[PDB]
Write an enzyme that holds these catalytic residues in place. Structure first.
Site, PDB file in Angstrom:
ATOM      1  N   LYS A 113       0.821  -1.205   0.000  1.00 35.14           N
ATOM      2  CA  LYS A 113       0.000   0.000   0.000  1.00 35.14           C
ATOM      3  C   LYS A 113       0.855   1.255   0.000  1.00 35.14           C
ATOM      4  O   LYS A 113       0.453   2.270  -0.580  1.00 35.14           O
ATOM      5  CB  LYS A 113      -0.933   0.022   1.207  1.00 35.14           C
ATOM      6  CG  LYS A 113      -2.058  -0.979   1.167  1.00 35.14           C
ATOM      7  CD  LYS A 113      -2.767  -0.942   2.506  1.00 35.14           C
ATOM      8  CE  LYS A 113      -3.966  -1.863   2.565  1.00 35.14           C
ATOM      9  NZ  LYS A 113      -4.563  -1.734   3.929  1.00 35.14           N
ATOM     10  N   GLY A 139     -10.493 -17.575  13.974  1.00 33.90           N
ATOM     11  CA  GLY A 139     -11.029 -18.865  13.592  1.00 33.90           C
ATOM     12  C   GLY A 139     -12.492 -18.898  13.181  1.00 33.90           C
ATOM     13  O   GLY A 139     -12.951 -19.940  12.696  1.00 33.90           O
TER      14      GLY A 139
END
Lengths: 298, 283
Positions: A132, A166
Site C-alpha cells: 500500500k 477462527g
C-alpha cells in the site's frame, strides 16, 4: 454536476459495498468487469445487478494498458477496493497498472486506492503495508490527487466474532481476550466505510488528504465489545486473558495484524482532528453502533 | 403457515428458493453447517436471510442427529444442490428417522431424469425417497435462463454475443427457457399445494418454449442488429454433453404436458419472465 466514479474491484467484499454506496449517493457509477468474469455465475449476476440500479459496465483487463486508459477516461474518479477473499497476496500492487493508466489519461480528478484499514506509514515498526505504501508513492509521483480512507477495523471480521480468530460469529461459551481487553479499537460496519468513502471522494475538503474513519461511539475496547454482547445475551462468557508474551512468532500455521490492533493500540494511538475524521465531516451518516451490529447474531 | 427447511440455501438455486419461500409467507429455515463460520460470503448470505425473517439451524452432514433434529423443526424439506447430489440420501435417512415431514422436494430443477453422472444420482435419491415412504414433489423440465438464454445458448459465456452467434443445427429445436426465480417461485407455491403431492410438476411456461433461432431473434428485435450466424451441425459439435440432448435431440419437449402437471397453469398468477424481458438487462 454529478461525479462519474469507476469502482475497481466491484465484486469483492468491500468493492460491492462501494458500488452500492456510490449509487445511493447519486454518483454515475461505473464498474470494471474483466474479460474472465463471463464464466462466473455469481460475478455476472452480481455485476448485472449493479446495472439494474444504474451502474455501467466497462470491460477491461489489467494486463491490457489501453483498455485500462480507455476505461478511466469515461470517469472523473477511480476507487479501488482490492483486498480480501476474491483477491491475492499481491493484487494491491496491481493498482500500479491503474496509476500508470490514470496518468496517461490525464482527466482523473481523484484516485482513492485500496486503503480501508490500518493506516500504513503508521506501521514503520511492525507485507500489506509495503504494497500500500508503494501504491501511494506511485500515486504521488504521478501527480494524481488522492484521498486515503484509513483507520477502520472491519466489523464482519473483528466485531461479529467478538474479535475471536477462527470464526466470523460469536462463540457459544468461551472468548479469548487480548491483553486485558483494555486497548481501544475502532469497530466499523463496512457499509459505513463505504458510505463515508462515497461522500468523501468528491468533497473538496479531503483532496490530497488522509480521512480517518473513527465514529466516536464505536471506539471501543475488546472487553467493552464482548460486554455489549454479554449484556444482549444475558450470559457471561468464560474469559481467558492472553498476554502480550504468548507469541506465535514461529513456524506453526496462521494474523499478527491482530497484535497491531489489540496490543499496540494502533487504530487509536493518535488523536484525529475533526477535519480529518469521517464521522465529523459527514455527521449525517447514522453509522451502526456495535450493540445494533451484533443483534443480528442472537 | 408452512415451515420449510431449504438445504443448500447458499447455492445459486438454493438462495432463490429461500427468498421465494420467505416471499410466499412460509416460515423458512436454512441450514448453517460448521464449515460456514469462516466463509464470509456464506455468512453474509445466511444472516441476510435472518434479516428477512428466516431462521438458521446449525447442523452438519457428518453428524446424523443434528439433521434429524433439524428436520423435526419443520414440515417440508426442499433440497437444492450446488456445492454431491447423493448427500440427499443422508437427508432421506434423517427425514425417515424424524417422520414428521409432510413433503420432500429433492434437488432436481433441471431436466427430468426419467428421460435419462448426475441422473443416476437424482434417480437413486428418488428411489430412496419412495422406498422410505416420504411424500414428494419433483420440480423438473427447464433450461435455466442464466446458463442458456442470457448467452443466447453460446458456450463459454453468460452474456450475449457482440456480433457472431452459433446456431445448433437449424436452431429449430424447441427448448424451454425459464428464469430461475420463477423456478423458485413455482417451487414455493407447489411445496404444500394438495394437488402436487407425490406428483411431478413441469416448469414449462408456454411463451418460453422457444427454438434457439426464435430466441436469437428476440435479441435481434431488442438490439435492432442482425448477428452473423454460423450453423453448426450435430457432427461438428465436439469437445455438457447436455447441450447436445437439449439442442439437437430436443429432449425438453418430446413429451407434451397436461395443464394438471405444469406450473404456469397450476399457478397462473405467477407472471413468469419472458425472454424478451429477461434479455433486456444485457443491452
Amino acid at each position: 454536476e454529478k461525479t462519474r466514479v469507476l469502482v475497481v474491484g466491484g465484486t469483492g467484499t468491500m468493492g460491492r459495498r462501494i458500488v452500492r454506496a456510490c449509487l445511493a449517493e447519486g454518483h454515475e457509477t461505473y464498474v470494471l468487469q474483466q474479460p474472465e468474469t463471463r464464466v462466473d455465475i455469481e460475478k455476472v449476476q452480481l455485476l448485472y445487478s449493479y446495472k439494474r440500479l444504474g451502474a455501467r459496465l466497462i470491460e477491461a483487463s489489467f494486463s491490457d494498458h489501453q483498455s485500462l486508459v480507455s476505461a478511466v477516461k469515461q470517469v472523473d474518479i477511480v476507487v479501488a477496493a482490492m483486498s480480501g477473499v476474491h483477491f491475492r497476496s499481491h493484487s494491491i500492487l496491481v493498482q500500479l497498472k491503474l496509476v500508470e493508466a490514470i496518468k496517461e489519461a490525464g482527466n482523473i480528478k481523484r484516485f482513492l486506492p485500496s486503503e480501508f484499514g490500518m493506516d500504513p506509514s503508521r506501521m514503520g515498526h511492525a507485507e500489506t503495508f509495503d504494497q500500500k505504501l508503494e501504491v501511494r508513492n506511485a500515486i504521488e509521483a504521478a501527480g494524481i490527487p488522492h484521498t486515503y480512507v484509513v483507520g477502520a477495523c472491519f466489523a464482519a471480521y473483528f466485531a461479529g466474532n467478538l474479535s475471536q480468530m477462527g470464526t466470523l460469529i460469536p462463540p457459544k461459551k468461551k472468548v479469548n481476550i487480548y491483553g486485558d481487553g483494555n486497548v481501544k479499537v475502532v469497530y466499523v460496519d463496512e457499509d459505513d466505510i463505504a458510505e463515508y468513502t462515497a461522500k468523501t471522494l468528491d468533497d473538496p475538503r479531503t483532496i490530497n488528504k488522509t480521512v480517518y474513519v473513527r465514529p466516536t461511539e464505536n471506539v471501543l475496547t475488546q472487553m467493552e465489545l464482548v460486554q455489549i454482547w454479554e449484556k444482549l445475551t444475558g450470559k457471561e462468557l468464560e474469559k481467558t486473558n492472553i498476554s502480550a508474551n504468548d507469541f506465535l512468532a514461529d513456524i506453526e500455521d496462521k494474523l499478527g495484524h491482530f497484535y497491531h490492533i489489540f496490543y499496540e493500540g494502533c487504530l487509536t494511538d493518535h488523536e484525529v482532528g475533526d477535519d480529518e475524521e469521517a464521522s465529523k465531516l459527514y455527521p449525517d451518516v447514522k453509522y451502526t453502533r456495535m450493540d445494533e451490529y451484533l443483534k443480528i447474531f442472537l
